[PDB]
Amino acid sequence: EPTCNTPSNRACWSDGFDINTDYEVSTPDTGVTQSYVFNLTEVDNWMGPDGVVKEKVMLINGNIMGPNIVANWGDTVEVTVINNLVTNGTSIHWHGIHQKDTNLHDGANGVTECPIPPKGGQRTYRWRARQYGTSWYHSHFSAQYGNGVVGTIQINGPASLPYDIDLGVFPITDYYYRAADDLVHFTQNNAPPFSDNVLINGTAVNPNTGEGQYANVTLTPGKRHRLRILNTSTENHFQVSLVNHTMTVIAADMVPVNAMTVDSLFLAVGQRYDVVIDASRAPDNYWFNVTFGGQAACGGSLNPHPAAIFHYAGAPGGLPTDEGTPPVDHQCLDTLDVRPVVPRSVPVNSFVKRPDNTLPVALDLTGTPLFVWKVNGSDINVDWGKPIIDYILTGNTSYPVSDNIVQVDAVDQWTYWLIENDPEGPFSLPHPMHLHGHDFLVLGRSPDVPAASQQRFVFDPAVDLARLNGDNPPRRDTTMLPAGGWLLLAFRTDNPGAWLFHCHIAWHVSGGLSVDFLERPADLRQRISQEDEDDFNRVCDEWRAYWPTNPYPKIDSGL
Ligand SMILES: *[C@@H]1O[C@H](CO)[C@@H](O[C@@H]2O[C@H](CO)[C@@H](O)[C@H](O)[C@H]2NC(C)=O)[C@H](O)[C@H]1NC(C)=O
Numbered sequence: 001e002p003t004c005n006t007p008s009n010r011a012c013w014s015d016g017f018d019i020n021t022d023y024e025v026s027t028p029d030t031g032v033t034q035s036y037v038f039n040l041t042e043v044d045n046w047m048g049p050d051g052v053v054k055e056k057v058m059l060i061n062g063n064i065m066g067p068n069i070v071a072n073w074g075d076t077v078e079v080t081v082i083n084n085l086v087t088n089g090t091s092i093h094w095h096g097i098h099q100k101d102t103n104l105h106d107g108a109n110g111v112t113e114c115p116i117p118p119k120g121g122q123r124t125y126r127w128r129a130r131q132y133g134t135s136w137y138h139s140h141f142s143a144q145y146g147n148g149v150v151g152t153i154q155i156n157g158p159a160s161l162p163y164d165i166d167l168g169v170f171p172i173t174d175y176y177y178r179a180a181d182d183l184v185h186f187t188q189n190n191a192p193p194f195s196d197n198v199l200i201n202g203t204a205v206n207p208n209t210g211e212g213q214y215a216n217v218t219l220t221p222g223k224r225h226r227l228r229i230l231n232t233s234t235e236n237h238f239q240v241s242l243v244n245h246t247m248t249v250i251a252a253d254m255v256p257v258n259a260m261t262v263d264s265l266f267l268a269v270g271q272r273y274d275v276v277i278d279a280s281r282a283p284d285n286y287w288f289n290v291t292f293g294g295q296a297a298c299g300g301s302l303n304p305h306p307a308a309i310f311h312y313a314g315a316p317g318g319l320p321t322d323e324g325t326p327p328v329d330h331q332c333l334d335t336l337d338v339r340p341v342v343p344r345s346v347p348v349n350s351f352v353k354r355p356d357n358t359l360p361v362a363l364d365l366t367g368t369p370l371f372v373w374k375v376n377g378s379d380i381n382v383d384w385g386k387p388i389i390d391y392i393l394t395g396n397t398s399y400p401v402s403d404n405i406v407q408v409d410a411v412d413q414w415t416y417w418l419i420e421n422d423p424e425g426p427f428s429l430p431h432p433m434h435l436h437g438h439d440f441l442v443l444g445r446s447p448d449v450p451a452a453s454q455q456r457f458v459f460d461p462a463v464d465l466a467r468l469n470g471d472n473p474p475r476r477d478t479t480m481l482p483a484g485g486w487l488l489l490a491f492r493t494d495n496p497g498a499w500l501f502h503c504h505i506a507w508h509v510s511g512g513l514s515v516d517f518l519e520r521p522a523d524l525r526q527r528i529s530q531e532d533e534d535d536f537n538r539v540c541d542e543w544r545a546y547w548p549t550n551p552y553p554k555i556d557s558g559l
């Protein structure tokens with residue numbers, strides 16, 4: 001908990017801890033634990049926020065999102081998850097939480113654990129808050145989170161700018177009336193649909209019926225407000241802007257950055273930005289707009305103008321009256337202009353593309369179903385009843401090809417990775433690439449061009465080394481893989497474990513778009529505590545015993 005964190009000095013946190021402390025190697029010892037229970041249930045014919053009745057939802061504690069997790073830098077977070085769905089297993093991934101030597105609590109069913117069985121299955125996750133900022137959690141059971149199994153994480157800590165009010169979490173998500181599993185089946189043979197609506201902080205207005213409500217945020221005039229924006233969608237990538245206001249970014253994902261004032265922001269799926277907003281405009285009501293760019297290549301909604309209201313306290317009630325100005329087209333790309341407060345530096349003056357450091361993404365339209373995604377020649381397909389961790393605990397090293405294991409034995413070294421976006425395929429799409437267990441450095445990407453321009457780019461050392469940035473590049477957990485192009489990433493092998501790396505569009509990871517970095521398997525087997533081993537076995541026991549009774553087939557990757 002904080003001892004010197006105030007509106008005038010958000011840079012300070014407590015004795016020996018501030019915005020400049022390297023939070024990757026230094027953690028406050030609070031001795032405090034925050035507890036939550038997530039009770040999952042399945043509801044049919046559920047009337048949602050915009051009036052529309054949905055066939056089926058799967059909810060945490062009977063709400064549209066689960067608990068808002070709130071703790072301090074250095075606390076422990078402990079969550080009991082109880083699966084009262086009918087047929088589905090479940091696993092909760094803590095997106096943005098590195099799980100430093102807690103790989104078994106990562107929530108990747110088929111990798112770190114088996115799914116928690118239905119009809120009362122239970123498991124407790126426990127992790128340390130070694131990073132402060134805005135994150136989120138969600139099911140990793142195929143596309144299950146598309147049904148409602150999702151919520152926010154707020155870990156308090158220092159910030160790179162002074163601010164007066166913390167408005168809290170502000171999750172933005174696409175919203176589909178059809179259920180996740182039908183959408184998985186749909187996207188296996190059909191391009192993904194636009195979203196029926198966009199929920200902002202849990203609420204939206206129906207574009208046809210006018211039912212539902214606008215998110216309504218009250219700003220205190222003259223004050224600096226921290227707003228924690230998240231994109232918790234399954235596919236939609238968002239552009240956001242506040243009419244007649246700027247936003248000053250103070251963090252990207254769970255990494256604080258030097259303050260950057262912008263008129264608008266692109267958020268890929270899974271991305272977060274903490275911003276500061278100054279209520280220094282005439283007291284009034286202002287639209288907060290969700291827009292799309294990129295020639296629909298990274299999403300869209302059937303609601304043409306999803307919005308929230310920003311209301312100055314003391315202003316009249318009612319709807320904003322200035323519809324404002326369309327933001328610049330972000331071309332399905334996040335900004336590489338952010339600079340982490342705590343710096344990292346690495347050499348970018350030489351690189352050789354090789355099979356062992358290249359991950360070629362490929363759309364295969366030649367099998368069944370129609371749309372199958374492959375990485376390095378293979379579509380991922382995990383075994384819920386036999387996670388990689390079971391191999392580790394059993395000394396078995398013959399992993400199925402379908403597990404897309406990329407084994408990395410280097411101890412605490414920087415590793416570089418070239419991701420190629422189907423430069424020779426029929427067509428290519430932007431993908432939000434997400435890495436479990438670490439933040440990566442974004443050293444660079446193919447030239448920024450319009451998202452649907454069909455331009456194809458292969459890494460060329462001769463011209464591309466010069467475009468790389470090794471001097472405190474963007475560091476975060478999610479970044480865009482340009483359509484038709486490439487992305488050059490780097491992470492340090494400081495955390496033994498099995499760590500998924502995949503596109504975060506539910507339909508694409510469903511259809512195979514992922515690898516699994518097996519980081520220091522040898523060190524891993526040694527760091528698994530007896531309590532994690534026993535509990536891993538207990539849960540796998542119960543799943544394996546349940547699965548032969550499940551009425552439904554596994555129809556996708558499992559992720
Ligand atoms: C998870 O539970 C859902 C909800 O019942 C299942 O989704 C159904 O799946 C079947 C078989 O593919 C479809 O015919 C239905 O249309 C789906 N219903 C809905 C509302 O999506 C899904 O099969 C379950 N997954 C597993 C492996 O148990």
Ligand SMILES: *[C@@H]1O[C@H](CO)[C@@H](O[C@@H]2O[C@H](CO)[C@@H](O)[C@H](O)[C@H]2NC(C)=O)[C@H](O)[C@H]1NC(C)=O
Pocket residue numbers: 167168169170201202216217218
């Ligand atoms: C997001 O929505 C939540 C849920 O409605 C809001 O939480 C409420 O905040 C108001 C104003 O402080 C309180 O009167 C309620 O008691 C809160 N409800 C709960 C359950 O927390 C939250 O304010 C919204 N976020 C933003 C940024 O406006």
Ligand SMILES: *[C@@H]1O[C@H](CO)[C@@H](O[C@@H]2O[C@H](CO)[C@@H](O)[C@H](O)[C@H]2NC(C)=O)[C@H](O)[C@H]1NC(C)=O
Pocket residue numbers: 216217218309311312313314315316317318319
């Ligand atoms: C959003 O919330 C604010 C805060 O409650 C509402 O502002 C009030 O609006 C009424 C008239 O509707 C005024 O009489 C009050 O003086 C306002 N309170 C404050 C603190 O300014 C506002 O109505 C809400 N906006 C909408 C459209 O629902």
Ligand SMILES: *[C@@H]1O[C@H](CO)[C@@H](O[C@@H]2O[C@H](CO)[C@@H](O)[C@H](O)[C@H]2NC(C)=O)[C@H](O)[C@H]1NC(C)=O
Pocket residue numbers: 287288289290291305306307319323324325326327
């Ligand atoms: C921000 O969102 C608002 C509210 O959805 C948009 O306002 C609508 O603008 C359209 C386009 O001309 C009008 O036809 C509607 O009547 C407006 N609706 C309301 C409720 O007033 C606004 O256009 C959006 N601005 C941007 C820049 O996207």
Ligand SMILES: *[C@@H]1O[C@H](CO)[C@@H](O)[C@H](O)[C@H]1NC(C)=O
Pocket residue numbers: 039040041062082084
């Ligand atoms: C889960 O929630 C249900 C429905 O509200 C409740 O009846 C049940 O007791 C809960 N189970 C547990 C173990 O919390």
Ligand SMILES: *[C@@H]1O[C@H](CO)[C@@H](O)[C@H](O)[C@H]1NC(C)=O
Pocket residue numbers: 355356357358359376405406
């Ligand atoms: C991709 O597969 C090739 C075999 O064709 C292998 O040599 C290479 O190491 C693989 N790359 C990665 C990072 O898995």
Ligand SMILES: [Cl-]
Pocket residue numbers: 094095096097098435436437438477
């Ligand atoms: Cl993660």
Ligand SMILES: [Cu+2]
Pocket residue numbers: 093095138270434504
């Ligand atoms: Cu995620």
Ligand SMILES: [Cu+2]
Pocket residue numbers: 093094095096434435436
């Ligand atoms: Cu994740």
Ligand SMILES: [Cu+2]
Pocket residue numbers: 430431432503504505508509513
């Ligand atoms: Cu993708």
Ligand SMILES: [Cu+2]
Pocket residue numbers: 093140434436500502
């Ligand atoms: Cu994941």
Ligand SMILES: [Xe]
Pocket residue numbers: 347348349350351416443468
């Ligand atoms: Xe590099």
Ligand SMILES: [Xe]
Pocket residue numbers: 417435440489490491501
């Ligand atoms: Xe990576």
Ligand SMILES: [Xe]
Pocket residue numbers: 359375419501502503513514515
């Ligand atoms: Xe990948």
